[PDB]
Design an enzyme around this catalytic site. Sequence first.
Site, PDB file in Angstrom:
ATOM      1  N   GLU A  28       0.802  -1.243   0.000  1.00 30.05           N
ATOM      2  CA  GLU A  28       0.000   0.000   0.000  1.00 30.05           C
ATOM      3  C   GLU A  28       0.835   1.294   0.000  1.00 30.05           C
ATOM      4  O   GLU A  28       0.770   2.077   0.948  1.00 30.05           O
ATOM      5  CB  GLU A  28      -1.038  -0.003   1.143  1.00 30.05           C
TER       6      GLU A  28
ATOM      7  N   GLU B  35      -4.487  -8.712  -0.548  1.00 28.34           N
ATOM      8  CA  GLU B  35      -5.085  -8.458   0.769  1.00 28.34           C
ATOM      9  C   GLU B  35      -6.487  -7.858   0.634  1.00 28.34           C
ATOM     10  O   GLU B  35      -6.718  -7.005  -0.224  1.00 28.34           O
ATOM     11  CB  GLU B  35      -4.195  -7.522   1.600  1.00 28.34           C
TER      12      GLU B  35
END
Length: 389
Positions: free
Chosen positions: A139, A228
Amino acid sequence: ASDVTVNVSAEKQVIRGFGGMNHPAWAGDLTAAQRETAFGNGQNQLGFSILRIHVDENRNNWYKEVETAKSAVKHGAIVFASPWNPPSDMVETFNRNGDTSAKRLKYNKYAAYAQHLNDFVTFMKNNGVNLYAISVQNEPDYAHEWTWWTPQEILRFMRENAGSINARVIAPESFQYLKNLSDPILNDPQALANMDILGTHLYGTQVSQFPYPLFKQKGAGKDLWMTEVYYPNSDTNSADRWPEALDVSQHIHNAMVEGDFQAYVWWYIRRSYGPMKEDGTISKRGYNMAHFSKFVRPGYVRIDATKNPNANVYVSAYKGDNKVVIVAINKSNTGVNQNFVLQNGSASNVSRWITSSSSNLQPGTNLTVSGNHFWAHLPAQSVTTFVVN
Ligand SMILES: O=C(O)[C@H]1O[C@H](O)[C@H](O)[C@@H](O)[C@@H]1O
Ligand SMILES: N[C@H](Cc1c[nH]c[nH+]1)C(=O)O
């Protein structure tokens, strides 16, 4: 109602697996029993075939990942790794639109960051875990609490340093499958050659954003992994809510069919909102995952099947190992009779498992295929996995 047509000859993406995250520092390691529940494929076991682990910032912490990772390999699971921060000595503060606490990797420590990733690969090797792949950064486009990377900085690393990592490389792991972070890699031949897996998260991602035309155009011979997520939420003790948990399987269905993903990886494995409850049992959300993980094994290829044959009915199909697997979700309050037509395939027997109110991945009646089709009922608010022999 309708036919569902399943075309055994119309092949889509190859499946690598389904699984989740282990994180000893934040969530606490899985116990010996929970490892078996997580990665075994027997009765009351998830059959997860992927394990995600983190690359700790401090290399003296690395030993903590070993036990659960060895257990995953032992069961046939592939392990991959994602880092949140480079080691502090490689990190600087900078001005990201007014914000000055923002952290990034120092422009002169890129090589050193690659070496740190490589050393983690070597470490796990020496402890008998051959990492399938490793991520550049988790991220980098939502890094308030870790390390920011801009598309261009990601690009530079991929061009220049990713080639030195002696494993498959996953990038860029955007929090929401934002194409801007991944577009530069796809348009650049050198960075593209150093990318083995396009990885992404799907937090807040609408189903209309699941497809990726640029990847279809440029990503030949590259994998596409969903690395994820949790869904539909992280509400405490939510994992047994019914019919809410049925959203999980619908979500996987959409990733498979709309996103053409090859891997689907949940967040924390053990968690009050996760596939495994804190008492070590599989939750209703876990059984929704298991409807894929236990039957769509690595090496299976998705095949074409009528995806929405009735209101609130969702179907995907897979083949491998002399079997055709069909996952059929009914999100209505009406049971539907479905006729499944098999094209380009001979079959005789069909077994099935159902999750519904008061039943967890529970065997249903065997069915017979006669003349390339079979009828089967899909109960209100249920997911069924059919296995065609
Ligand atoms: O799925 C079921 O239980 C039943 O429903 C189908 O509609 C089919 O016609 C039956 O033969 C089957 O036994
Ligand atoms: N065993 C292959 C398909 C496969 C299953 N698992 C990996 N590959 C076959 O159907 O002949």
